[PDB]
Structures are given as structure tokens and as C-alpha cells.
mmCIF file of all heavy atoms in Angstrom:
data_model
loop_
_atom_site.group_PDB
_atom_site.id
_atom_site.type_symbol
_atom_site.label_atom_id
_atom_site.label_comp_id
_atom_site.label_asym_id
_atom_site.label_seq_id
_atom_site.Cartn_x
_atom_site.Cartn_y
_atom_site.Cartn_z
ATOM 1 N N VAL J 1 10.747 3.763 -4.943
ATOM 2 C CA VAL J 1 11.317 5.094 -5.371
ATOM 3 C C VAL J 1 10.230 6.114 -5.642
ATOM 4 O O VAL J 1 10.537 7.348 -5.591
ATOM 5 C CB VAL J 1 12.384 4.974 -6.496
ATOM 6 C CG1 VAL J 1 13.387 3.936 -6.129
ATOM 7 C CG2 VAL J 1 11.552 4.548 -7.851
ATOM 8 N N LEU J 2 9.107 5.667 -5.880
ATOM 9 C CA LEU J 2 7.838 6.524 -6.230
ATOM 10 C C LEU J 2 7.077 6.995 -5.000
ATOM 11 O O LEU J 2 6.167 7.874 -5.088
ATOM 12 C CB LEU J 2 7.068 5.788 -7.207
ATOM 13 C CG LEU J 2 7.708 5.355 -8.546
ATOM 14 C CD1 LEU J 2 6.749 4.662 -9.503
ATOM 15 C CD2 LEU J 2 8.603 6.359 -9.257
ATOM 16 N N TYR J 3 7.286 6.244 -3.858
ATOM 17 C CA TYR J 3 6.681 6.746 -2.616
ATOM 18 C C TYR J 3 7.396 8.038 -2.029
ATOM 19 O O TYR J 3 8.638 8.210 -2.337
ATOM 20 C CB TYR J 3 6.564 5.720 -1.554
ATOM 21 C CG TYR J 3 5.615 4.552 -1.965
ATOM 22 C CD1 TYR J 3 5.842 3.566 -2.801
ATOM 23 C CD2 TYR J 3 4.220 4.651 -1.404
ATOM 24 C CE1 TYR J 3 4.871 2.589 -3.090
ATOM 25 C CE2 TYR J 3 3.254 3.766 -1.737
ATOM 26 C CZ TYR J 3 3.510 2.726 -2.588
ATOM 27 O OH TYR J 3 2.611 1.794 -2.939
ATOM 28 N N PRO J 4 6.811 8.675 -1.074
ATOM 29 C CA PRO J 4 7.362 9.837 -0.521
ATOM 30 C C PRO J 4 8.510 9.444 0.270
ATOM 31 O O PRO J 4 9.556 10.142 0.478
ATOM 32 C CB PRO J 4 6.335 10.366 0.421
ATOM 33 C CG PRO J 4 5.041 9.974 -0.172
ATOM 34 C CD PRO J 4 5.256 8.614 -0.804
ATOM 35 N N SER J 5 8.675 8.180 0.860
ATOM 36 C CA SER J 5 9.677 7.678 1.590
ATOM 37 C C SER J 5 9.631 6.090 1.697
ATOM 38 O O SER J 5 8.532 5.494 1.396
ATOM 39 C CB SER J 5 9.572 8.210 3.129
ATOM 40 O OG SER J 5 8.491 7.703 3.808
ATOM 41 N N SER J 6 10.718 5.467 2.135
ATOM 42 C CA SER J 6 10.767 4.040 2.380
ATOM 43 C C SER J 6 9.681 3.626 3.422
ATOM 44 O O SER J 6 9.061 2.588 3.303
ATOM 45 C CB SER J 6 12.108 3.578 2.749
ATOM 46 O OG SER J 6 13.009 3.782 1.720
ATOM 47 N N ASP J 7 9.528 4.386 4.424
ATOM 48 C CA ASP J 7 8.484 4.142 5.470
ATOM 49 C C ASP J 7 7.101 4.069 4.878
ATOM 50 O O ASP J 7 6.302 3.191 5.275
ATOM 51 C CB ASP J 7 8.541 5.208 6.608
ATOM 52 C CG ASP J 7 9.697 4.924 7.491
ATOM 53 O OD1 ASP J 7 10.405 3.919 7.387
ATOM 54 O OD2 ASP J 7 9.870 5.877 8.523
ATOM 55 N N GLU J 8 6.858 4.918 3.845
ATOM 56 C CA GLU J 8 5.504 5.056 3.201
ATOM 57 C C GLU J 8 5.343 3.810 2.348
ATOM 58 O O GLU J 8 4.293 3.106 2.466
ATOM 59 C CB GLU J 8 5.315 6.273 2.396
ATOM 60 C CG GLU J 8 5.070 7.534 3.328
ATOM 61 C CD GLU J 8 3.719 7.504 3.936
ATOM 62 O OE1 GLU J 8 3.586 6.969 5.123
ATOM 63 O OE2 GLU J 8 2.775 8.082 3.315
ATOM 64 N N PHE J 9 6.433 3.529 1.618
ATOM 65 C CA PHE J 9 6.477 2.198 0.783
ATOM 66 C C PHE J 9 6.083 1.101 1.643
ATOM 67 O O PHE J 9 5.188 0.315 1.332
ATOM 68 C CB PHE J 9 7.824 2.087 0.229
ATOM 69 C CG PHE J 9 8.067 0.733 -0.386
ATOM 70 C CD1 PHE J 9 7.482 0.400 -1.604
ATOM 71 C CD2 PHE J 9 8.937 -0.149 0.186
ATOM 72 C CE1 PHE J 9 7.737 -0.770 -2.299
ATOM 73 C CE2 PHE J 9 9.262 -1.386 -0.560
ATOM 74 C CZ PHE J 9 8.677 -1.695 -1.703
ATOM 75 N N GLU J 10 6.645 0.942 2.831
ATOM 76 C CA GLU J 10 6.346 -0.158 3.756
ATOM 77 C C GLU J 10 5.012 -0.124 4.414
ATOM 78 O O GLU J 10 4.203 -1.166 4.277
ATOM 79 C CB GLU J 10 7.502 -0.242 4.882
ATOM 80 C CG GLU J 10 8.926 -0.464 4.445
ATOM 81 C CD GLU J 10 9.297 -1.848 3.812
ATOM 82 O OE1 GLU J 10 8.391 -2.714 3.749
ATOM 83 O OE2 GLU J 10 10.358 -1.882 3.295
ATOM 84 N N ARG J 11 4.659 1.103 4.893
ATOM 85 C CA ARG J 11 3.194 1.232 5.475
ATOM 86 C C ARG J 11 2.188 0.940 4.492
ATOM 87 O O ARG J 11 1.266 0.217 4.821
ATOM 88 C CB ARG J 11 3.150 2.692 6.033
ATOM 89 C CG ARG J 11 1.815 2.954 6.651
ATOM 90 C CD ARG J 11 1.645 4.429 7.108
ATOM 91 N NE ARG J 11 1.424 5.261 5.903
ATOM 92 C CZ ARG J 11 0.253 5.500 5.301
ATOM 93 N NH1 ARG J 11 -0.888 4.922 5.779
ATOM 94 N NH2 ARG J 11 0.250 6.304 4.301
ATOM 95 N N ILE J 12 2.249 1.419 3.367
ATOM 96 C CA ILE J 12 1.233 1.196 2.287
ATOM 97 C C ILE J 12 1.268 -0.259 1.809
ATOM 98 O O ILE J 12 0.252 -0.859 1.587
ATOM 99 C CB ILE J 12 1.263 2.241 1.022
ATOM 100 C CG1 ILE J 12 1.053 3.658 1.609
ATOM 101 C CG2 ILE J 12 0.272 1.848 -0.029
ATOM 102 C CD1 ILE J 12 -0.278 4.050 1.917
ATOM 103 N N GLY J 13 2.422 -0.875 1.732
ATOM 104 C CA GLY J 13 2.415 -2.299 1.332
ATOM 105 C C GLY J 13 1.705 -3.131 2.420
ATOM 106 O O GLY J 13 0.928 -4.000 2.003
ATOM 107 N N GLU J 14 1.862 -2.787 3.666
ATOM 108 C CA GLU J 14 1.067 -3.529 4.754
ATOM 109 C C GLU J 14 -0.462 -3.151 4.744
ATOM 110 O O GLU J 14 -1.281 -4.119 5.072
ATOM 111 C CB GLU J 14 1.660 -3.202 6.185
ATOM 112 C CG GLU J 14 2.952 -3.805 6.428
ATOM 113 C CD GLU J 14 3.668 -3.362 7.706
ATOM 114 O OE1 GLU J 14 3.185 -2.293 8.291
ATOM 115 O OE2 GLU J 14 4.679 -3.879 8.130
ATOM 116 N N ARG J 15 -0.848 -2.167 4.160
ATOM 117 C CA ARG J 15 -2.236 -1.749 4.005
ATOM 118 C C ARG J 15 -2.903 -2.526 2.779
ATOM 119 O O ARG J 15 -4.004 -2.905 2.773
ATOM 120 C CB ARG J 15 -2.546 -0.320 3.872
ATOM 121 N N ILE J 16 -2.007 -2.546 1.672
ATOM 122 C CA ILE J 16 -2.458 -3.268 0.514
ATOM 123 C C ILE J 16 -2.852 -4.706 0.765
ATOM 124 O O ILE J 16 -3.773 -5.247 0.288
ATOM 125 C CB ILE J 16 -1.482 -3.149 -0.678
ATOM 126 C CG1 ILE J 16 -1.251 -1.642 -1.089
ATOM 127 C CG2 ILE J 16 -1.840 -4.076 -1.879
ATOM 128 C CD1 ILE J 16 -0.144 -1.468 -2.058
ATOM 129 N N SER J 17 -1.815 -5.343 1.529
ATOM 130 C CA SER J 17 -1.843 -6.798 1.659
ATOM 131 C C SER J 17 -3.030 -7.475 2.130
ATOM 132 O O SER J 17 -3.689 -8.308 1.425
ATOM 133 C CB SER J 17 -0.689 -7.349 2.517
ATOM 134 O OG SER J 17 0.547 -7.326 1.690
ATOM 135 N N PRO J 18 -3.633 -7.019 3.296
ATOM 136 C CA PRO J 18 -4.873 -7.706 3.754
ATOM 137 C C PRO J 18 -6.103 -7.388 2.871
ATOM 138 O O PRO J 18 -6.980 -8.286 2.757
ATOM 139 C CB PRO J 18 -5.042 -7.213 5.140
ATOM 140 C CG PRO J 18 -4.237 -6.037 5.261
ATOM 141 C CD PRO J 18 -3.046 -6.188 4.343
ATOM 142 N N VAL J 19 -6.135 -6.240 2.216
ATOM 143 C CA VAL J 19 -7.250 -5.850 1.472
ATOM 144 C C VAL J 19 -7.250 -6.645 0.152
ATOM 145 O O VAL J 19 -8.281 -7.239 -0.360
ATOM 146 C CB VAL J 19 -7.328 -4.328 1.167
ATOM 147 C CG1 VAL J 19 -8.372 -4.045 0.137
ATOM 148 C CG2 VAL J 19 -7.635 -3.564 2.473
ATOM 149 N N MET J 20 -6.074 -6.801 -0.502
ATOM 150 C CA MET J 20 -5.899 -7.553 -1.756
ATOM 151 C C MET J 20 -6.170 -9.039 -1.587
ATOM 152 O O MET J 20 -6.949 -9.689 -2.352
ATOM 153 C CB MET J 20 -4.473 -7.432 -2.284
ATOM 154 C CG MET J 20 -4.286 -8.131 -3.591
ATOM 155 S SD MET J 20 -5.110 -7.224 -5.111
ATOM 156 C CE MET J 20 -3.710 -5.937 -5.517
ATOM 157 N N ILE J 21 -5.633 -9.695 -0.376
ATOM 158 C CA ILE J 21 -5.846 -11.045 -0.077
ATOM 159 C C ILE J 21 -7.391 -11.316 0.188
ATOM 160 O O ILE J 21 -7.873 -12.308 -0.428
ATOM 161 C CB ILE J 21 -5.102 -11.363 1.237
ATOM 162 C CG1 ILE J 21 -3.642 -11.463 0.903
ATOM 163 C CG2 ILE J 21 -5.606 -12.842 1.811
ATOM 164 C CD1 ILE J 21 -2.766 -11.444 2.243
ATOM 165 N N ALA J 22 -8.049 -10.405 0.923
ATOM 166 C CA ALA J 22 -9.450 -10.571 1.258
ATOM 167 C C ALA J 22 -10.365 -10.521 0.078
ATOM 168 O O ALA J 22 -11.351 -11.170 -0.221
ATOM 169 C CB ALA J 22 -9.888 -9.682 2.385
ATOM 170 N N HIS J 23 -10.039 -9.550 -0.804
ATOM 171 C CA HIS J 23 -11.038 -9.055 -1.873
ATOM 172 C C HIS J 23 -10.614 -9.380 -3.326
ATOM 173 O O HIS J 23 -11.355 -9.275 -4.279
ATOM 174 C CB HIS J 23 -11.464 -7.654 -1.702
ATOM 175 C CG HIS J 23 -11.989 -7.351 -0.274
ATOM 176 N ND1 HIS J 23 -13.256 -7.796 0.142
ATOM 177 C CD2 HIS J 23 -11.370 -6.628 0.675
ATOM 178 C CE1 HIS J 23 -13.364 -7.399 1.386
ATOM 179 N NE2 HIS J 23 -12.247 -6.596 1.729
ATOM 180 N N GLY J 24 -9.284 -9.594 -3.486
ATOM 181 C CA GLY J 24 -8.721 -9.854 -4.884
ATOM 182 C C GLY J 24 -8.500 -8.640 -5.677
ATOM 183 O O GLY J 24 -8.045 -8.721 -6.849
ATOM 184 N N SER J 25 -8.860 -7.484 -5.093
ATOM 185 C CA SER J 25 -8.500 -6.185 -5.749
ATOM 186 C C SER J 25 -8.298 -5.116 -4.713
ATOM 187 O O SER J 25 -8.518 -5.209 -3.622
ATOM 188 C CB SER J 25 -9.683 -5.741 -6.713
ATOM 189 O OG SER J 25 -10.844 -5.429 -6.013
ATOM 190 N N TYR J 26 -7.674 -4.056 -5.177
ATOM 191 C CA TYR J 26 -7.272 -3.021 -4.287
ATOM 192 C C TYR J 26 -7.392 -1.584 -5.045
ATOM 193 O O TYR J 26 -7.007 -1.430 -6.204
ATOM 194 C CB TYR J 26 -5.871 -3.097 -3.815
ATOM 195 C CG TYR J 26 -5.408 -2.015 -2.849
ATOM 196 C CD1 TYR J 26 -5.685 -2.102 -1.539
ATOM 197 C CD2 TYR J 26 -4.743 -0.810 -3.390
ATOM 198 C CE1 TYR J 26 -5.257 -1.101 -0.606
ATOM 199 C CE2 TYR J 26 -4.384 0.150 -2.475
ATOM 200 C CZ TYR J 26 -4.653 -0.011 -1.068
ATOM 201 O OH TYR J 26 -4.210 0.992 -0.172
ATOM 202 N N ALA J 27 -7.916 -0.592 -4.331
ATOM 203 C CA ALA J 27 -7.926 0.783 -4.860
ATOM 204 C C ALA J 27 -7.751 1.764 -3.661
ATOM 205 O O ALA J 27 -8.247 1.561 -2.508
ATOM 206 C CB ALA J 27 -9.272 1.097 -5.566
ATOM 207 N N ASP J 28 -6.987 2.775 -3.939
ATOM 208 C CA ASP J 28 -6.893 3.983 -2.937
ATOM 209 C C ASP J 28 -6.414 5.215 -3.551
ATOM 210 O O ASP J 28 -6.204 5.232 -4.760
ATOM 211 C CB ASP J 28 -5.988 3.497 -1.757
ATOM 212 C CG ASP J 28 -4.570 3.622 -2.064
ATOM 213 O OD1 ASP J 28 -4.166 4.451 -3.112
ATOM 214 O OD2 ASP J 28 -3.633 2.999 -1.405
ATOM 215 N N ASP J 29 -6.526 6.330 -2.776
ATOM 216 C CA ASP J 29 -5.666 7.504 -3.180
ATOM 217 C C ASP J 29 -4.600 7.535 -2.107
ATOM 218 O O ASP J 29 -4.726 7.336 -0.926
ATOM 219 C CB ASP J 29 -6.643 8.767 -2.902
ATOM 220 C CG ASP J 29 -7.789 8.781 -3.916
ATOM 221 O OD1 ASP J 29 -7.754 8.099 -5.033
ATOM 222 O OD2 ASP J 29 -8.743 9.473 -3.643
ATOM 223 N N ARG J 30 -3.338 7.971 -2.664
ATOM 224 C CA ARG J 30 -2.242 8.329 -1.689
ATOM 225 C C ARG J 30 -1.408 9.342 -2.419
ATOM 226 O O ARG J 30 -1.391 9.645 -3.568
ATOM 227 C CB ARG J 30 -1.559 7.074 -1.302
ATOM 228 C CG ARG J 30 -0.380 6.691 -2.461
ATOM 229 C CD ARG J 30 -0.917 6.082 -3.681
ATOM 230 N NE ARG J 30 -1.476 4.766 -3.404
ATOM 231 C CZ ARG J 30 -0.738 3.679 -3.489
ATOM 232 N NH1 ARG J 30 0.501 3.734 -3.728
ATOM 233 N NH2 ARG J 30 -1.319 2.453 -3.243
#
């Protein structure tokens, strides 16, 4: 509900996942 849209929620979720898995932490601007 805090994303600009459901598509953004989904798109960013897919970006978070491999970075978090690989590195154990995540940071971005959006």
C-alpha cells in the first residue's frame, strides 16, 4: 500500500530478493 502501485511492489520485491539472499542486507532509494 506504500508503493506507487502493485506493479512497483512486485518489481521491487524481485530486486530485493537476490541482493538480500546474496549479501544478507539490502539498501536502496525508491
Side-chain angles (χ1 to χ4, degrees), residues 1-14 16-30:
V1 303
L2 307 181
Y3 289 85
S5 67
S6 296
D7 285 353
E8 283 292 89
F9 172 69
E10 304 291 353
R11 185 187 68 86
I12 300 282
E14 288 174 347
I16 293 170
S17 281
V19 172
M20 181 75 85
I21 290 165
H23 305 292
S25 70
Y26 182 87
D28 77 21
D29 293 337
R30 86 289 288 274

